[PDB]
Design a protein around this nucleic acid. Structure first.
Ligand code: CL
Ligand code: CL
Ligand code: CL
Ligand code: CL
Ligand code: CL
Ligand code: K
Ligand code: MG
Ligand code: MG
Ligand code: MG
Ligand code: MG
Ligand code: MG
Ligand code: MG
Ligand code: MG
Ligand code: MG
Ligand code: MG
Ligand code: MG
Ligand code: MG
Ligand code: MG
Ligand code: MG
Ligand code: MG
Ligand code: MG
Ligand code: MG
Ligand code: MG
Ligand code: MG
Ligand code: MG
Ligand code: MG
Ligand code: MG
Ligand code: NA
Ligand code: NA
Ligand code: NA
Ligand code: NA
Ligand code: NA
Ligand code: NA
Ligand code: NA
Ligand code: NA
Ligand code: NA
Ligand code: NA
Ligand code: NA
Ligand code: NA
Ligand code: NA
Ligand code: NA
Ligand code: NA
Ligand code: NA
Lengths: 53, 142, 132, 337
RNA sequence: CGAGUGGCUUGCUACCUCGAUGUCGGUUCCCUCCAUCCUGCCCGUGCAGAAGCGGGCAAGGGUGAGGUUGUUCGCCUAUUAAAGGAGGUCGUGAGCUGGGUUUAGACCGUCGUGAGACAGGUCGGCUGCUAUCUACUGGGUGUGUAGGUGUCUGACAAGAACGACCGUAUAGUACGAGAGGAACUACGGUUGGUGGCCACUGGUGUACCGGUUGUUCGAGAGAGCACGUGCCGGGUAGCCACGCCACACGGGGUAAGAGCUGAACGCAUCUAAGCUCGAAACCCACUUGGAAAAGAGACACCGCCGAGGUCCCGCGUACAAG
RNA sequence: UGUCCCAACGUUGGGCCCGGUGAACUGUACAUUCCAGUGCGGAGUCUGGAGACACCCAGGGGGAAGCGAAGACCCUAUGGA
């Protein structure tokens, strides 16, 4: 699998599958990514993000 | 191992109590006694009750404790103790100079004290220490 | 009941107010009990995914308000674990009112439902839009 | 009316005190079924990671699917039987009779033992067989020890000596099987005893935590409500009733916690390999790198990383052994992050 | 109507304490009883089944959560296998709490000439002590057993280390007109308890990095203070639980009971002698402790001018000293 | 909203070990007790058993009807205000 935030390959047997109010699914590889999105940031602007690399 | 017993008594088919009483008797006269074949000693009565007594005594205890033996070794010696003033320095000595054995680890056959022998042909209501022991849940090593 | 095929960590307590996921005319539901669950001294009764609970209708239509009905937990905010180890958390906590046989009292279901819910309550499941 | 409630903690792991040996000692042994063999091994705890697997259980509806399982890595380099000990049967239990040793001693077995210089491996043997003729030969166990040197991550070199049991077909057979294992050099390995899939019991001396309150030591409650801001936060209401005018032992008090021995039951062996298949990136924190003879254990294991843990084929298994489970993916991802 | 047992209630008695044995209720934490609410094995039935009804053995384990009330009691809800009762100075204030009873202030009603009263009601109204002995939890130093290293044994001791439920198949089957509706056995799960662990999820993380408000070091660069981080964002290790692993079966002996063989009593009879079976209870099993078990143990090796140990030095898989 | 479910980890001052300083409470005597019993009917000290090698550190306070106050509650006094 691949992270729907950062884009880094997610390690099998690791992670959270967030489910939105509409129904959409978003897999995060870490708590860092979750809280970075809960702030209002987009993976594109964050430099350390592979999406941005 | 090695006990220069002046007297070697055989408990086989004998009434444990009567036996422990005569032993106490002698151990107080300095006599170095060694009781043998304890597992084969007998105590008259109704088995189902005789056991409750012994069981109860095992349950008994708390922090301080009430160490009651389960092997036919201990049971006998502990019975003998009760016939001695084990806490006075004279009776301690008399007690300690007495030992109980499982089976016969000696060369001579033990002797049967008078009137201690039980008649199997005339009595059907009695128990072998070994039985009680196994009942109490002791490991049958003999 | 039959295995959920997933490990749950209860997100609800007796007294918890949650969302009514259906067109029953109920909007807010209040937890009250947990079928087949007995706690321990002081422990407040825990409710988690796929649990047949007992509920008090908190908000809604003047006909549905204050009605003691059974229901099933379909979504919660606490992460629940799947076989492959991943975690699964939802947006809110919710449940759809149910009857004696365990068939939905309402017609349609609003919002998603965890796939594990299907295995215990198919009649509710076979009436679902999204099954995550 | 005082709602009921089970007591706080078990009276079965008492008295909760420090253990006598940092090395675990088994009290029970596996019965004598199959062929002659040693009933136990050892190794040093390395760390935690997950291994992805194929649902083995034929009664699992999910049978045959992917499934992530937690695994405690443990280093199990070959141990060495240095002698055969034989107990005899007396009306006072079982007592050692004699020991039959070797000559080939590990370059560092002297850091613990006063290694033999002049022993009689024939007369003792002789005496043993004689006890057997007589019918007073109780079980046979080998004195075994490890090679801490073999595990770089383990700082210690001084071998952890300990006795494991041998039980086979007849008594004669395992006496010989015993003799032979020894005669050579005593060298043996995990594979020799265990096999992946099988169930084993892992005994070990838990992580030590020093003195601790009753809350953490017995799972009692801290004070609640207003009670907690009063000057008592983590101590019980009372030590007991008026009479009996004394404090029982059954009442939870302050004391030593951890570093007690526990023989954790029914642990599954995922795989027994060699090399660095298990090792993590960065390195097993507070432990190091693994590369060599190992064993993967399902779930947790007593003790912290670097502690000696012994194995023994589960004596009270519940499930039938589902041999050599398929290993699809062992995670090497770092432990820090 | 008659005979009794217990000592929860109530009353009677005035032996005990007035140089004081701190109240009720609650809480917390510990052992217990059986007159058993559930769970195990039985019997009878106005026992078809399912579901009940009455009785027997049985104290292993459980017996929970909330609304009014200071309440105990009790009334009510929803769950539940069931949400049993009682003893321990009506267990527990050198543990907590202080809502009620029962100080001093005040109001109401009633009584009273009045001061003032009430077995009427209401608002406010304090919780002292540095443990000497004993007791138990854990930890050390000596002595005894009479040189050291390592490995053992097991008298005895502790355990609830496990209890219970739901579901699937057996089965829409047995039984029943029908409705309805079992079981043995095999599986999977939940819950309570228990022991351990940190790959994983979550907490913390005044280690660390970043953003930013005020002010001071002229600006900048870089920093201090803003309570023991200014605030905010992120957070490693570790410690943790809300995270994860593990926690039998089976034997042996019995109770209530079902039976066998069987006499006293030619017959009959489960009992008197004897024998077969049979409880979640009892013994083993299994976990933990345990040579100071005074019968103070066993083995192996090394050594008695030398084996081995202490201090010392670098550190912890250990740690309040030790 | 950590009041609670149900607790965790952290900070600061103590706490613990070392140097220095250095009190009080309390003390018929003996005193390693525990289970029963018995006694002015609530015993470490009597009776019967059980158990107990001595010394020490730390702890939370079960008991000494622990210490503190010649009971405020009750009645008595040919008492007081
Ligand atoms: Cl005891
Ligand atoms: Cl005496
Ligand atoms: Cl007779
Ligand atoms: Cl409830
Ligand atoms: Cl409290
Ligand atoms: K009084
Ligand atoms: Mg409560
Ligand atoms: Mg980590
Ligand atoms: Mg990660
Ligand atoms: Mg009087
Ligand atoms: Mg008092
Ligand atoms: Mg009864
Ligand atoms: Mg029926
Ligand atoms: Mg009980
Ligand atoms: Mg009281
Ligand atoms: Mg009580
Ligand atoms: Mg008290
Ligand atoms: Mg007080
Ligand atoms: Mg008050
Ligand atoms: Mg009031
Ligand atoms: Mg008041
Ligand atoms: Mg105080
Ligand atoms: Mg600062
Ligand atoms: Mg006395
Ligand atoms: Mg007076
Ligand atoms: Mg007065
Ligand atoms: Mg006057
Ligand atoms: Na007799
Ligand atoms: Na006993
Ligand atoms: Na305070
Ligand atoms: Na205070
Ligand atoms: Na009375
Ligand atoms: Na007095
Ligand atoms: Na009270
Ligand atoms: Na019971
Ligand atoms: Na109530
Ligand atoms: Na009292
Ligand atoms: Na007080
Ligand atoms: Na009180
Ligand atoms: Na049985
Ligand atoms: Na000794
Ligand atoms: Na807090
Ligand atoms: Na005390």
């Amino acid at each position: 699998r691949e992270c729907d935030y950062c884009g880094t390959d997610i390690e099998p047997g690791t992670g959270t599958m967030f489910v939105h109010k509409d129904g959409a699914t978003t897999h995060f590889c870490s708590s860092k990514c979750e809280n970075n999105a809960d702030l209002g940031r987009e993976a594109r602007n964050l430099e350390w993000t592979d999406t941005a690399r | 191992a090695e006990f220069d017993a002046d007297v070697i008594v055989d408990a086989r088919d004998c009434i444990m109590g009567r036996v422990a009483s005569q032993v106490a008797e002698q151990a107080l006269d300095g006599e170095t006694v060694a009781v043998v074949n304890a597992e084969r000693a007998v105590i008259t009565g109704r088995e189902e009750q005789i056991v409750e007594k012994y069981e109860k005594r095992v349950d008994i205890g708390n922090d301080n404790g009430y160490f009651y033996p389960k092997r036919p070794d201990g049971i006998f010696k502990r019975t003998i103790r009760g016939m001695l003033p084990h806490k006075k320095q004279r009776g301690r000595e008399a007690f300690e100079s007495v030992r109980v054995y499982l089976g016969n680890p000696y060369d001579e056959d033990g002797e049967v004290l008078d009137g201690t022998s039980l008649d199997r042909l005339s009595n059907i209501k009695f128990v072998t220490l070994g039985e009680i022991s196994e009942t109490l849940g002791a490991n049958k090593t003999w | 009941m039959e295995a959920l095929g997933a490990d749950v960590t209860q997100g609800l307590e007796k007294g918890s107010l949650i969302t009514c996921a259906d067109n029953t005319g109920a909007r807010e539901l209040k937890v009250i009990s947990v079928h087949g669950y007995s706690g321990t001294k002081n422990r407040l009764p825990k409710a988690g995914l796929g649990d047949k609970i007992t509920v008090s209708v908190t908000k809604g239509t003047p006909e549905m308000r204050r009605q003691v009905l059974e229901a099933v937990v379909v979504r919660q905010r606490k992460p629940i674990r799947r076989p492959d180890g991943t975690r699964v958390k939802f947006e809110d906590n919710a449940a759809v009112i149910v009857d004696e046989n365990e068939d939905p009292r309402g017609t349609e279901l609003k919002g998603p439902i965890a796939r594990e819910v299907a295995q215990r309550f198919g009649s509710v499941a076979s009436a679902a839009t999204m099954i995550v | 009316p005082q709602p009921s409630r089970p007591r706080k903690g078990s009276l079965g792991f008492g008295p909760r005190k420090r253990s006598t040996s940092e090395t675990p000692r088994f009290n029970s042994w596996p019965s004598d079924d199959g062929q002659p063999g040693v009933q136990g091994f050892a190794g040093y705890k390395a760390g935690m990671t997950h291994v992805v697997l194929v649902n083995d259980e034929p009664n699992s509806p999910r049978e045959g699917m992917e499934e992530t399982v937690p695994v405690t890595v443990i280093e199990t380099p070959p141990m060495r039987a240095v002698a055969l000990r034989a107990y005899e049967d007396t009306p006072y239990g079982q007592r050692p009779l004699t020991e039959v040793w070797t000559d080939e001693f590990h370059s560092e077995l002297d850091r613990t033992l006063d290694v033999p210089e002049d022993h009689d491996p024939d007369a003792a043997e002789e005496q043993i067989r004689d006890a057997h003729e007589a019918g007073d030969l109780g079980d046979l166990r080998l004195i075994t020890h490890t090679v801490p040197d073999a595990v770089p991550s383990v700082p210690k070199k001084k071998p952890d000596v300990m006795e494991t049991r041998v039980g086979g077909g007849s008594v004669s057979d395992r006496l010989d099987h015993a003799l032979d294992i020894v005669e050579d050099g005593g060298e043996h390995a995990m594979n020799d005893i265990f096999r992946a899939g099988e169930y084993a019991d892992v005994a070990g001396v838990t992580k030590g935590k020093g003195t601790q309150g009753p809350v953490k030591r017995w799972g009692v409650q801290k004070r609640k409500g207003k009670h907690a801001r009063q000057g008592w936060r983590r101590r019980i209401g009372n030590l007991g009733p008026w009479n009996p005018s004394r404090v029982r032992s059954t009442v939870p008090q302050q004391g030593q916690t951890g570093y007690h021995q526990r023989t954790e039951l029914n642990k599954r062996l995922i795989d027994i390999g060699e090399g660095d298949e298990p090792t993590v990136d960065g390195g097993f924190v507070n432990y190091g790198e693994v590369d060599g003879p190992y064993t993967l254990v399902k779930g947790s294991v007593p003790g912290p990383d670097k502690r000696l843990v012994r194995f023994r084929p589960a004596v009270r298994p519940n499930d039938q052994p589902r041999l050599d489970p398929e290993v699809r993916y062992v995670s090497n991802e770092s432990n820090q992050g």
